[PDB]
Design a binder for this molecule. Sequence first.
Ligand SMILES: CCCCCCCCCCCCCCCCCC(=O)OC[C@H](COP(=O)(O)OCCN)OC(=O)CCCCCCCCCCCCCCCCC
Ligand SMILES: CCCCCCCCCCCCO[C@@H]1O[C@H](CO)[C@@H](O[C@H]2O[C@H](CO)[C@@H](O)[C@H](O)[C@H]2O)[C@H](O)[C@H]1O
Ligand SMILES: CCCCCCCCCCCCO[C@@H]1O[C@H](CO)[C@@H](O[C@H]2O[C@H](CO)[C@@H](O)[C@H](O)[C@H]2O)[C@H](O)[C@H]1O
Ligand SMILES: Nc1nc2c(ncn2[C@@H]2O[C@H](COP(=O)(O)OP(=O)(O)OP(=O)(O)O)[C@@H](O)[C@H]2O)c(=O)[nH]1
Ligand SMILES: N=C(N)NC(=N)NCCc1ccc(I)c(Cl)c1
Ligand SMILES: [Mg+2]
Lengths: 174, 39, 347, 48, 320, 104, 98, 140, 112
Amino acid sequence: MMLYIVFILSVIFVMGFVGFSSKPSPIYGGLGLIVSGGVGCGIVLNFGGSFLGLMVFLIYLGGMMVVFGYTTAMATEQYPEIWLSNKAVLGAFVTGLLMEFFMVYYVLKDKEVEVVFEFNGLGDWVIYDTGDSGFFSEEAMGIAALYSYGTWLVIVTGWSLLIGVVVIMEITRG
Amino acid sequence: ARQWQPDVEWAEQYGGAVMYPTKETAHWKPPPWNDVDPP
Amino acid sequence: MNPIIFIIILLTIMLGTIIVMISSHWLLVWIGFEMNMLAIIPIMMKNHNPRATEASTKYFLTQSTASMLLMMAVIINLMFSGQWTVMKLFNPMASMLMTMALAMKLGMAPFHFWVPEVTQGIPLSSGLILLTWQKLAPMSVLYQIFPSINLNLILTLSVLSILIGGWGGLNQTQLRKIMAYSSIAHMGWMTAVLPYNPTMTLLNLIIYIIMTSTMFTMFMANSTTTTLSLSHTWNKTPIMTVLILATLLSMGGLPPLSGFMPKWMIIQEMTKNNSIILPTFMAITALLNLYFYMRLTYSTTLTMFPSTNNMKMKWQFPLMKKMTFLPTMVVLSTMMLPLTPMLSVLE
Amino acid sequence: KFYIQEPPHGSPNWLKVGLTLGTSVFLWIYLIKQHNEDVLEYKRRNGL
Amino acid sequence: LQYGPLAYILGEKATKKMTEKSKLITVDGNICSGKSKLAKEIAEKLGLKHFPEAGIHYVDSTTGDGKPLPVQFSGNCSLEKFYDDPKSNDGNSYRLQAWLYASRLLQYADALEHLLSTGQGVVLERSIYSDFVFLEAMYRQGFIRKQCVDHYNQVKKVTICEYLPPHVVVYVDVPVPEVQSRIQKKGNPHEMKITSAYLQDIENAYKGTFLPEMSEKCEVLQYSAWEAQDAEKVVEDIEYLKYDKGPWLDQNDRKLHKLRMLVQDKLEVLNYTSIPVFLPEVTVGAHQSDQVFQEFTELPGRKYRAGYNEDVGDKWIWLK
Amino acid sequence: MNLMLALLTNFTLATLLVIIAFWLPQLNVYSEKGSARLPFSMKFFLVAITFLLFDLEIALLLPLPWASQTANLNTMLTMALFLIILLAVSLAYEWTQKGLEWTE
Amino acid sequence: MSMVYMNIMMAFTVSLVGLLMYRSHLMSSLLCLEGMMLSLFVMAALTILNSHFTLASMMPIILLVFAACEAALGLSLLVMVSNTYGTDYVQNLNLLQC
Amino acid sequence: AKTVLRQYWDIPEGTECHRKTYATTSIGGAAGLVVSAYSVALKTPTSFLEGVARTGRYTFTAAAIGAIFGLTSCISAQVREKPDDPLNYLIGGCAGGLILGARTRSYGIGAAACAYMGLTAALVKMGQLEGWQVFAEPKV
Amino acid sequence: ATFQFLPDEARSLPPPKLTDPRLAFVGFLGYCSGLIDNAIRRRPVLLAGLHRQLLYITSFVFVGYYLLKRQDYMYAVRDHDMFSYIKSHPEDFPEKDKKTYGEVFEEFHPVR
Ligand SMILES: CCCCCCCCCCCCCCCCCC(=O)OC[C@H](COP(=O)(O)OCCN)OC(=O)CCCCCCCCCCCCCCCCC
Ligand SMILES: CCCCCCCCCCCCO[C@@H]1O[C@H](CO)[C@@H](O[C@H]2O[C@H](CO)[C@@H](O)[C@H](O)[C@H]2O)[C@H](O)[C@H]1O
Ligand SMILES: CCCCCCCCCCCCO[C@@H]1O[C@H](CO)[C@@H](O[C@H]2O[C@H](CO)[C@@H](O)[C@H](O)[C@H]2O)[C@H](O)[C@H]1O
Ligand SMILES: Nc1nc2c(ncn2[C@@H]2O[C@H](COP(=O)(O)OP(=O)(O)OP(=O)(O)O)[C@@H](O)[C@H]2O)c(=O)[nH]1
Ligand SMILES: N=C(N)NC(=N)NCCc1ccc(I)c(Cl)c1
Ligand SMILES: [Mg+2]
């Protein structure tokens, strides 16, 4: 059901993580992270975070992950190794999927599961808020408050980014 | 006899990669004097 | 490095630390650590060689991992209390994660492997920052979250650090590795007393920093990084050999020198809490540190090792390195015990 | 002229000397003023 | 304002004082090649500062009153002993060589500090780049041991890597028979004991190793003995050089500031010339070095830092 | 639901066009006729890294249209200009340090 | 807790184990580090959005910005390692063994 | 470790020998497993089977010491009719030292282990009798 | 107070005497630093730069005085807090009934 969309997305989220965390060729590992990023944006979208969802796409996938792929093509892997060709990667990949499937199957059968800690399995919709009728996005109000409330945050964030530029020019000059 | 002071043989005890040689660290060598390894 | 850039990078290392110390918000604490780690890397890399690049990479991986674990602890804390205030955490799993993260940042055993290697691979001035200024921010967080730390975890880390630091230093001829293992041992005393009296943690931290700065500054003065190179000091700067002797004995905790004061006070606080076995075990184990401190005094000050002929050329030139604050620090490093009651200013 | 190269500390740095002594004098005057002000505030607050 | 980061920040950048006349010239050659005379003429004609070849007492010339010090304060290195008894069991042969490389290293630092501080070029006679030809000759003739050569290369490896090579290398090529004739004419009794085989070794190292190596990174000019007599033509050759090689093209103010901070600090210059490698030729026992150091501190104007020696006329010590 | 359907249609059609573009009748009956440093300048790394850092700054400027609706306009305008000026200082630093050059 | 939290924490654990279990490529380990950041971003965003903590809505952005700057530093170290040895293999970074 | 240590310290001394020996064998085995884990992690075995062999050799050695200490110390207390006696633990600790002198085959190690593991075991019994705290709870 | 070296309430305490023995020791430490400064730079130890040696003493004394002020204030606060707490909770700090040694029984342990 579409009532479990958030849960389903989080299942794919984990599968993408078991994908690159098993560490295949950095080219394929990058693909697994890109898929996870998109699935992660969808999870954030369904909780009412449109801007935060699109920042993952704009900045995390279009920004950082592009530079990761760019750097991989330059200084790491130019041609991928066959995926799951190494036994260690396959064992790790299979093990994570087997663990994940058991969690999913048990939480769906009992509508709850205790994997270390106890979780509910009724669906994530149950915790949602029931009274919204404002003429604005609350997430947008909060982020816009960076410029009124967050003067200190802007100063230290802006400073760190400038120092990042200076630092990386020092590191790479060699 | 004048006071004994360390000789070269005594000094070289402290010029190795480790203080206590073992089978495992036999291949260790002291690092470069200026910390630079050749390219 | 351009001197103005060096200054700005150094000021950013300090600012990252200060943000951690003045922050009341976990996010700003995390930012302070991130800013601090960003600025420290260039000073580790500044001599451009494979050893420096390996040291910076090992440092980056350790610190970035620890900072992710810290962020995870903060977020778990947010879910179980709905607030960000820097104070006791409201979840035992969050407390463990934050404690482990701060242990990794401090280089406490069994997360210690990076300290000897990173310190060896960077210049003396960079190692001085790494082993002194860089301990301030993680200690200042432990100072605030200790009401919720797991006692068994923190004391296990302390005991392991004193053991690993003492044993690890016995096998070293490189001065930078000796200071690294010495740092691991001293972090153990700082955290062992934290559950009982955090003021003694501050006292041990301050005295540790003063003594460590004195050693590094004296090593820089003569450009010495090995035991044998240090053993030539007697034939160039005899005064330095005496200052090293006093500082090493102080670092060994011998009375009536300054370095005895932290061990003295920590033992007192622990016994007041009916902790008798742990202080005694700690004090005996610290004799391992005293041993490899004494070895250095033997090859530096109490005997005269062989020299070289080219050393005579050095006789004709004076020391030109800055040695900033060295006269002040060496006096504090050795002659402070009569002023022990002054520790109350740290309350 | 004994030295073949003029030493960096052949002649005193009079500006540094003047600042050094001037700084020492200032700290002593400030310290005695602070102590005097502390003693009076103490006597006043305790009624002595 | 003694040079440092503060002076650099306030505008003391090397590129300001440097010109296309700011060049480092080294004159090389076998023994008795008239390279000393050529070096002086080049310096006079090009308006450069001339450095006489760094000998056993070069460091004495730069410190104290500048006059030479007794021999024991140079470790008892004797060039005359090298000729009379090159195989002495006391190790004088390599001890002299190790001392002379350190003397050249110090001189190269002085010359570079002069070039970078004032902008005036300099002329040297041999340098740390060509010092090895004498080491090769010594080893091939069996005067020094293989271990001494290994020690020399260790010291050279961590020292020469810090410094820029000369702008112009000048070689005066004189054949060994002509070298051997000029030596017997010079009438120095110890030098006449030099043998042609040793001289041929110096020549081979110069042509086999030095000149090919410096050609990659410097401007190399080679003159026969006759051509060196025409100093004006030699100077004319130098001024028409393109300078399209070597690291001097990569330098900028930031790198030259780092270089100037090294060369001005002489102890930092000589740091690795005393690496703790216990070679019998250069190792000194504690009792001897202790005794000699104590005598050195008793020499006039040596007990204290320069300017703090009342025994040689320093005043205002209590305000310094 | 509509956005999901649009996305599913767009990439499903793209997939169908790609596969049919690969598998079409050919009318032939005979046999048909690694992870190192790529030789690529460090300059191209610095462009990508420079883009990333500027992109992170852009993320912080994106809320500006909403921030201009605040009553704390004095603070908001000061902080907007501060961030953009710092971005300009970043560019000035790369520029004057020859980080934007393609020679050598 | 809610069902989604089970998988988000699982994703963080999976990437942490991936990070602590190195293979050969340094880039593969840097990807795991970004994976932990992405899971932290999602977990923080979900918690903040569901609780309607309005002013905390900017926190995930700050997390993203700072961690991307961290990743840029990490990549720069990787290329310098690759320039030295011709690969980004961690086994080459063992000089400080002695 | 909490629960295993709770089973052991709940059984009265000198009685229920088989339960005491099980508790120490589990304690000893766990210590052996921890040592194997770090040993295999930090000193990579040349092969998969060498690493498995090392894990068994260490774990069995540690379980052997744990078993002998529990049995010998419980047998002594039972036979002597002295439950609250540190001597029984001193006897069991030395027995463990001998085993460590046998698995490593070194009379010197066995003699040193028996004295030091023997003394350590006796101090543990004294601490239990008198309430000595290793990780003392903060109180002042 | 809050992040205050010497809060306003510290002014009610007698200041340290300028002849405090601890302050004399602090001045002595500054003098020793001045001599070590001469020694490490190979100047005449006792005579060189008396201006520099004077500032070493003055700096130590100046900082030492304020540190001693804060030290005494903190100990005064410790006592203030302790006594106020003993008053607030008289039930936990009762006056012990004292007996003389004529009434108290002590076992005797002969040394023979
Ligand atoms: C006040 C309350 C607190 C009490 C705690 C105890 C305080 C003592 C610790 C103070 C800190 C150490 C300061 C020591 C200053 C040393 C200065 C000195 O004594 O002379 C050094 C001497 C000078 O040699 P030189 O440079 O050549 O000048 C003379 C020309 N020959 O150099 C030499 O000639 C080399 C000498 C050979 C080495 C001999 C070493 C044995 C003497 C050690 C003296 C220092 C004591 C250190 C340990 C503390 C002792 C309690
Ligand atoms: C209160 C504490 C009580 C603790 C009691 C501990 C008893 C331990 C007894 C160990 C006795 C020997 O202790 C140490 O071990 C070895 C045995 O391998 C001894 O045997 C020695 O024999 C020969 C010498 O000819 C050499 O091979 C070598 O020196 C060593 O093996 C050493 O001389 C001794 O340094
Ligand atoms: C060379 C020497 C090296 C250092 C040796 C250090 C020895 C230190 C002594 C060991 C610590 C004391 O040991 C510990 O004491 C407490 C006493 O409260 C015991 O406390 C026990 O009491 C009750 C009943 O008695 C038990 O039901 C319970 O399981 C447990 O709480 C612990 O079971 C014991 O583990
Ligand atoms: N063993 C040794 N002797 C050296 C070294 N440098 C110079 N000499 C000696 O110094 C002496 C004089 O040096 P030269 O300049 O070459 O002779 P010169 O005739 O006076 O000068 P020119 O005519 O220019 O050649 C020679 O006998 C050399 O052997 C050296 O590095 N090692
Ligand atoms: N946390 C602890 N165990 N110790 C502690 N700080 N106790 C508070 C008691 C105390 C002691 C000295 C002073 I001066 C002051 Cl004002 C207060
Ligand atoms: Mg000549």
